[PDB]
Amino acid sequence: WTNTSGSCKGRCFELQEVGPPDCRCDNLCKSYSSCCHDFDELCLKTARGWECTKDRCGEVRNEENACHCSEDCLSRGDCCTNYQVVCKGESHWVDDDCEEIRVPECPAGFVRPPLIIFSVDGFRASYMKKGSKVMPNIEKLRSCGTHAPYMRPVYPTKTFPNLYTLATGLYPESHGIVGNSMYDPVFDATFHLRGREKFNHRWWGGQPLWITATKQGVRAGTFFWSVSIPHERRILTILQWLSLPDNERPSVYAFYSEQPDFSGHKYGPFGPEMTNPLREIDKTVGQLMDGLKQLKLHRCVNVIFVGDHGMEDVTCDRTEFLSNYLTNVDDITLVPGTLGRIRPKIPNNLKYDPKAIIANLTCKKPDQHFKPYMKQHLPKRLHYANNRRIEDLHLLVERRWHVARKPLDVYKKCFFQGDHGFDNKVNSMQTVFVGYGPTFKYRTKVPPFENIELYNVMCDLLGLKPAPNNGTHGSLNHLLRTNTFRPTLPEEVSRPNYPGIMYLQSDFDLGCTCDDKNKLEELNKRLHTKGSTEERHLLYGRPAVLYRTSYDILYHTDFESGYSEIFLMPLWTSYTISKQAEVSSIPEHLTNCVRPDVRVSPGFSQNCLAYKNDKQMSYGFLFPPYLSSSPEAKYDAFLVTNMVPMYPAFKRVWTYFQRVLVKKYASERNGVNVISGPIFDYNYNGLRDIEDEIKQYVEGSSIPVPTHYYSIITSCLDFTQPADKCDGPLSVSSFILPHRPDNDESCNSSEDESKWVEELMKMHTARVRDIEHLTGLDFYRKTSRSYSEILTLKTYLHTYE
Ligand SMILES: *[C@@H]1O[C@H](CO)[C@@H](O[C@@H]2O[C@H](CO)[C@@H](O[C@@H]3O[C@H](CO[C@H]4O[C@H](CO)[C@@H](O)[C@H](O[C@H]5O[C@H](CO)[C@@H](O)[C@H](O)[C@@H]5O[C@H]5O[C@H](CO)[C@@H](O)[C@H](O)[C@@H]5O)[C@@H]4O)[C@@H](O)[C@H](O)[C@@H]3O)[C@H](O)[C@H]2NC(C)=O)[C@H](O)[C@H]1NC(C)=O
Ligand SMILES: *[C@@H]1O[C@H](CO)[C@@H](O[C@@H]2O[C@H](CO)[C@@H](O)[C@H](O)[C@H]2NC(C)=O)[C@H](O)[C@H]1NC(C)=O
Ligand SMILES: *[C@@H]1O[C@H](CO)[C@@H](O[C@@H]2O[C@H](CO)[C@@H](O)[C@H](O)[C@H]2NC(C)=O)[C@H](O)[C@H]1NC(C)=O
Ligand SMILES: CN1CCN(C2=NC(=O)/C(=C/c3ccc(Cl)c(Cl)c3)S2)CC1
Ligand SMILES: [Ca+2]
Ligand SMILES: [K+]
Ligand code: NA
Ligand SMILES: [Zn+2]
Ligand SMILES: [Zn+2]
């Protein structure tokens, strides 16, 4: 219970931690219905608006006014933000020329530049193009500070998951806010945008910035604002807090605006009605900058202008209905709209039949505008599976469309033309980032990056040590003038062996057969020694193994590999394909050829008998026989230590990748270096499985079956230089392909591979960093580039938009 009869006199927007029965006066009291009776009259003053006029200059201080134009207001810290312009002949901040801020210019008493995070809801990156015509203050921040062309939100691309991701550096599956609405089966409780349940701390995991700051002795302003507090009051409050005594003043501040999201939903992103809310936001930014200038702080504070997601054209007319596919939709609950999450209406309903549901939802219309996925089958880049609040059954919805349970759930007259929530690589979902201030660079454009990276950077800006999170610390050092984080290479845990010849073909009984033999490499005395293999096929040093295991480096004319004696296959296989390289066939007599590897014990080798027994599993090769340098060298490709288990369904994709796509990439990029390998993630947590976690093996054997296969394709950013002779920065694209027994995911898979395989790979694009998590490997350790630049490279996602 709260004793409302208290008073907010001398307590308006206090940073005091005040708990019941005491009366509250903070920017969240209205949300808890715990404000003092006089909060609204003392703290939410509105009299005479938010701007000084000429007739108010030098007025007698009336404490009834929203803001002041009295002579004393400046030292009192509560002038209207335009006071000095109207009453003292100063210019607005926006009319001032841009000038580099090389060090903080702060008043005495300021020990460090404060950080102000200005968040705008639903600010699509492309709105920035409207420029100073519409948003002159924001355009000044963008052009004079540091900007990205866009920032990638997390999936789902909705507000709650993204705001909390910004605050924590975590994927939603980790922080727990996996949607604006969610059901937790252990709580048996439902979280909603609106309502009280979301105020319970049990939903919110990880460690948000304000907590990290507080725990390390840095004072945070209250980040959240009750929706009823107008933006002008939020700004005036931030400015007042900045005028506080040295021993009370916070170091970090957050402003939030619900626009331009609301107008985007109403009018769509390209609606002419969008100009008005963009102008209003800019006006708020201007009030903040004008205010900071009045406090002599405009060359002291770091400002981050950041959005949570974008906005797409979505209308009633583009709604898919599950009732068109399923017989009894009244028995399921659907989290609907720009994504789908399905569970039974009655929790744990025993009659719930997910396989039959998915079957009815799979490629049933030629123009179907969503695709069903068990969550472990979602593209790994989405990182959206490892949480009990994420339903097993998901629908990835096509941009511009909605999914709904049945037509009763749509009300045409419809009232909306915009929405968001889609796959976070969709262009319309991208949002904004600008950094302005002493610690940011001046007039600098940076490549787009993911919002999970910002928490580390805000920690850097504040001198904080970040809690464990999913950013890669150092990958954004290029945004900063100083306060960069000097990263340190992780230490290799397992050193490799370099086995020579220690066995004879007679030592092997694996059930393998090869109809021909290369008797010439048996006269090769330097066969499978290092030679120039490493400098040709391993351009950036060997991957470090960051876990305890046993593996062997194996050399070949056409490739090198790191063969695991535990998992019975390479952890990685690395090779370079020149622009001019030739594709060749697998000769008829070699179709079923598999050769034992004298370098590796028969005990640490797979056996072809298992593959003859398993009627469902087949096999493939990591280095492709199609790309052998010579008919002689091609024999290396058929080694048992280059072999991996693949379903025939997957082989349709992999062979087309090996035979057509790799050469296509080499042609277009002036040669490519490829590293390919297996991934084991049976518990779908995005992390390398331990042996105990692997759940499937080749029939009657102990050869483990990968859940995915990766490939990392690197070339010279300067495409005029061949990949193997690159002087400067690198260019990378990667994939994590799901290893599945069918191609149900690809609706056109009945057709030739040229009609569907690339479309699949694009969906499963990945960061090198993703692969590192999944493999326990560390790539690019030996290059001519800074470690910070390499970290940037590893976080890059090739999106194909
Ligand atoms: C993204 O980065 C994060 C942060 O580093 C990584 O997540 C971490 O992974 C490790 C390895 O599995 C986990 O270590 C385990 O910790 C548990 C005990 O963990 C408890 O205590 C920690 C510390 O206070 C706390 O963070 C944990 O919070 C989890 O559980 C809470 C209550 O259920 C929940 O509120 C919170 O959201 C979070 O849940 C998430 O993680 C759990 C797994 O712990 C998962 O089941 C859930 O679905 C969410 O994903 C928890 O109270 C020990 O018992 C183990 O032995 C082991 O040491 C960390 O717990 C985990 N940290 C967080 C914050 O998630 C991700 O791996 C990384 N992803 C990628 C792909 O790189
Ligand atoms: C709720 O708040 C009111 C106002 O603070 C409290 O009223 C005061 O109570 C004290 C002690 O009984 C009196 O001496 C004062 O005269 C009261 N102050 C005013 C301004 O009226 C009231 O006690 C609180 N109720 C509780 C504690 O449950
Ligand atoms: C999947 O779709 C089929 C139709 O393609 C549904 O089959 C109908 O189901 C009812 C009862 O099972 C039958 O009486 C109808 O004759 C069927 N319709 C037709 C035209 O075949 C099936 O119910 C759907 N499955 C689920 C789980 O929704
Ligand atoms: C439905 N909802 C209304 C309120 N809401 C918020 N109101 C605020 O004042 C918020 C401040 C904020 C500002 C920055 C960050 Cl990083 C975070 Cl986590 C929160 S967030 C979220 C969307
Ligand atoms: Ca795992
Ligand atoms: K077979
Ligand atoms: Na198919
Ligand atoms: Zn939003
Ligand atoms: Zn919205």
PDB file of N, CA and C and ligand atoms in Angstrom, residues 1 3-7 21, ligand 2:
ATOM      1  N   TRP A   1       0.819  -1.210   0.000  1.00  0.00           N
ATOM      2  CA  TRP A   1       0.000   0.000   0.000  1.00  0.00           C
ATOM      3  C   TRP A   1       0.857   1.265   0.000  1.00  0.00           C
ATOM      4  N   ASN A   3       0.943   5.417   0.771  1.00  0.00           N
ATOM      5  CA  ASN A   3       0.321   6.566   1.419  1.00  0.00           C
ATOM      6  C   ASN A   3       0.403   7.802   0.525  1.00  0.00           C
ATOM      7  N   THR A   4      -0.628   7.996  -0.288  1.00  0.00           N
ATOM      8  CA  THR A   4      -0.668   9.057  -1.290  1.00  0.00           C
ATOM      9  C   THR A   4      -0.708  10.473  -0.699  1.00  0.00           C
ATOM     10  N   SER A   5      -1.053  10.585   0.578  1.00  0.00           N
ATOM     11  CA  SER A   5      -1.238  11.902   1.188  1.00  0.00           C
ATOM     12  C   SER A   5       0.069  12.652   1.427  1.00  0.00           C
ATOM     13  N   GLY A   6       1.190  12.011   1.108  1.00  0.00           N
ATOM     14  CA  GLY A   6       2.480  12.672   1.162  1.00  0.00           C
ATOM     15  C   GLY A   6       2.576  13.755   0.103  1.00  0.00           C
ATOM     16  N   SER A   7       3.704  14.459   0.071  1.00  0.00           N
ATOM     17  CA  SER A   7       3.880  15.540  -0.892  1.00  0.00           C
ATOM     18  C   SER A   7       5.168  15.425  -1.707  1.00  0.00           C
ATOM     19  N   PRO A  21       5.478   2.167   2.388  1.00  0.00           N
ATOM     20  CA  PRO A  21       4.233   2.888   2.074  1.00  0.00           C
ATOM     21  C   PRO A  21       4.457   4.314   1.566  1.00  0.00           C
TER      22      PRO A  21
HETATM   23  C1  LIG B   2       0.172   9.359   5.351  1.00  0.00           C
HETATM   24  O1  LIG B   2       0.697  10.626   5.006  1.00  0.00           O
HETATM   25  C2  LIG B   2       0.259  11.716   5.789  1.00  0.00           C
HETATM   26  C3  LIG B   2       0.983  12.967   5.310  1.00  0.00           C
HETATM   27  O2  LIG B   2       2.376  12.767   5.436  1.00  0.00           O
HETATM   28  C4  LIG B   2       0.547  11.493   7.269  1.00  0.00           C
HETATM   29  O3  LIG B   2      -0.030  12.544   8.017  1.00  0.00           O
HETATM   30  C5  LIG B   2       0.896  13.008   9.024  1.00  0.00           C
HETATM   31  O4  LIG B   2       0.917  12.155  10.152  1.00  0.00           O
HETATM   32  C6  LIG B   2       1.676  12.626  11.243  1.00  0.00           C
HETATM   33  C7  LIG B   2       1.752  11.534  12.303  1.00  0.00           C
HETATM   34  O5  LIG B   2       0.477  10.954  12.475  1.00  0.00           O
HETATM   35  C8  LIG B   2       1.030  13.898  11.776  1.00  0.00           C
HETATM   36  O6  LIG B   2       1.706  14.355  12.927  1.00  0.00           O
HETATM   37  C9  LIG B   2       1.102  14.966  10.696  1.00  0.00           C
HETATM   38  O7  LIG B   2       0.383  16.107  11.111  1.00  0.00           O
HETATM   39  C10 LIG B   2       0.557  14.465   9.358  1.00  0.00           C
HETATM   40  N1  LIG B   2       1.084  15.305   8.302  1.00  0.00           N
HETATM   41  C11 LIG B   2       0.282  16.005   7.514  1.00  0.00           C
HETATM   42  C12 LIG B   2       0.955  16.863   6.481  1.00  0.00           C
HETATM   43  O8  LIG B   2      -0.944  15.967   7.610  1.00  0.00           O
HETATM   44  C13 LIG B   2       0.023  10.142   7.752  1.00  0.00           C
HETATM   45  O9  LIG B   2       0.524   9.867   9.041  1.00  0.00           O
HETATM   46  C14 LIG B   2       0.447   9.016   6.815  1.00  0.00           C
HETATM   47  N2  LIG B   2      -0.240   7.786   7.175  1.00  0.00           N
HETATM   48  C15 LIG B   2       0.390   6.702   7.633  1.00  0.00           C
HETATM   49  C16 LIG B   2       1.717   6.899   8.306  1.00  0.00           C
HETATM   50  O10 LIG B   2      -0.077   5.570   7.526  1.00  0.00           O
END
